[PDB]
Amino acid sequence: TLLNSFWFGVGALMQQGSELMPKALSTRIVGGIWWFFTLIIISSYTANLAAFLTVERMESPIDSADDLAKQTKIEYGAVEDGATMTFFKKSKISTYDKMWAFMSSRRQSVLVKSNEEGIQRVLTSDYAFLMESTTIEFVTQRNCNLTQIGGLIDSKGYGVGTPMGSPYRDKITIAILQLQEEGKLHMMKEKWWRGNGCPEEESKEASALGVQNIGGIFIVLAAGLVLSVFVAVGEFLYKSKKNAQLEKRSFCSAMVEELRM
Amino acid sequence: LNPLSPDIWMYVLLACLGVSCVLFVIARFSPYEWYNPHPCNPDSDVVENNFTLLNSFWFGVGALMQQGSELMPKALSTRIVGGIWWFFTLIIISSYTANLAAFLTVERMESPIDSADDLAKQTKIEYGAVEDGATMTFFKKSKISTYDKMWA
Amino acid sequence: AFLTVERMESPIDSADDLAKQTKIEYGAVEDGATMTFFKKSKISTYDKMWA
Fold first, then answer.
1. How does strand A111-112 pair with strand A78-79?
2. What distance in Å separates the CA atoms of residue A255 and residue C12, rounded to the nearest whole number?
3. Residue B134 assigned as binding residue
4. Which amino acid positions bind L-glutamate, per UniProt (chain C)?
């Protein structure tokens, strides 16, 4: 039938096939070649999908300070006259000099006048930033859109400036000595550095591929399942027209006979 | 079963359970499939039901796994049910292979550490040395770049 | 393998990206104020460029 030959048509793309195989020769050649269109496509489909879904796990930018040192898609930077790059220059160390060379090259967008400029810049584009690990807290713990990555790279400290041979220094170090040991300095930080609520940052889906990635397929099934029933009763009513008697009671018994057997 | 998350595992099997059920439902509301077994000598105008609830379940669960049953639908409306069901089956398993390949290419790559020069570039895990154990002195005094830079 | 290895290749996007690979050779107009930059260049990539 125009329905049978179409059934074997679609029933062959999917690797099942019906029991309506061509018993005749001239008809058979269609099946031989029709199959060859599928098996190449389906096999082409699988490998290609692996190609998409393998390069994804070939790369992950989660780590930093060497992981960031390897790729180039993400742009790096620091602050104009930033003491960080003064350290980060003449780094003499394994990776950071290689990072420093990268930012040294593009020395027009790496440097920013002040911290907020970079904070603006990361808000704009996919721009990683490298600076002091205290103010990053403020923007990430108050703007729930940015986040610190990596850990510690340097162990500097904020001090107070003073000329050489000033009696204030040792006189004021002891002043700072007792304040910190009193955690008075810690309490003073806790009031301006209290931070706000932030997400748990734990977003692991406990798998490689989950429902989010291919769940659209289940939706595809949902459409076909329901629409068939509408036509299923539709041809049943059309069948209820094929005997020219619109009344359904004989069909109601036909339903009942079906339940019994 | 590592590639797919367990949510798929549950969602699919319940879907297979349901799609088997609805097929059995439509099997009763299927005009053509009534097929008067052995119509060779139609002495008796009797038709026996096919696609029993046991069979209708058996197909989808048997079609999911790549065999295909012998109960291919013989009416119009019931045929669409399987065809959409097939498309679901083909994509999921073909997706299953792709993922499981991705795992084993990731692991086959990435070349675990085997030499000091691997640590030369690496910084995530740490070096280690006892100072003044005459070994640190060797690195600081050395003049080869890999040794020099790891001394830093 | 064909498709996946084909995908993972990348072009020489940047000068430093051109600095690593060596088969793709460099070039400049001789003494046309172009490599003369690379003479007194201070950046390592441009230094290794010039070498």
1. parallel
2. 72
3. yes
4. 33-34
Q: What is the resolution of this structure in A?
A: 3.8
Other CB atoms within 10 Å distance of the CB of residue A171? 9
The count of residues in chain B is 152
> Residue A178 has which token pair?
């007792």
Residues 6+ apart with CB under 8 A from A87: A154, A156
Substitution target from B21, B30, B95 for chain A, most A beta carbons within 10 A = B95
Report d(CA B25, CA B78) in Å as an integer: 10
Contact call for residues A175 and A160 (beta carbons, < 8 A): no
Point out which residues pair with B4 in neighbouring strands: A209
Elucidated via = cryo-EM
**Partners of chain B (3+ Cβ pairs below 8 A):** A
Question: Helices in A71-194 by DSSP H: which ranges?
Answer: 83-88, 96-105, 115-124, 135-140, 168-181, 184-192
Q: Which of C49, C23, C16, C21 is nearest to C35 (CA)?
A: C49
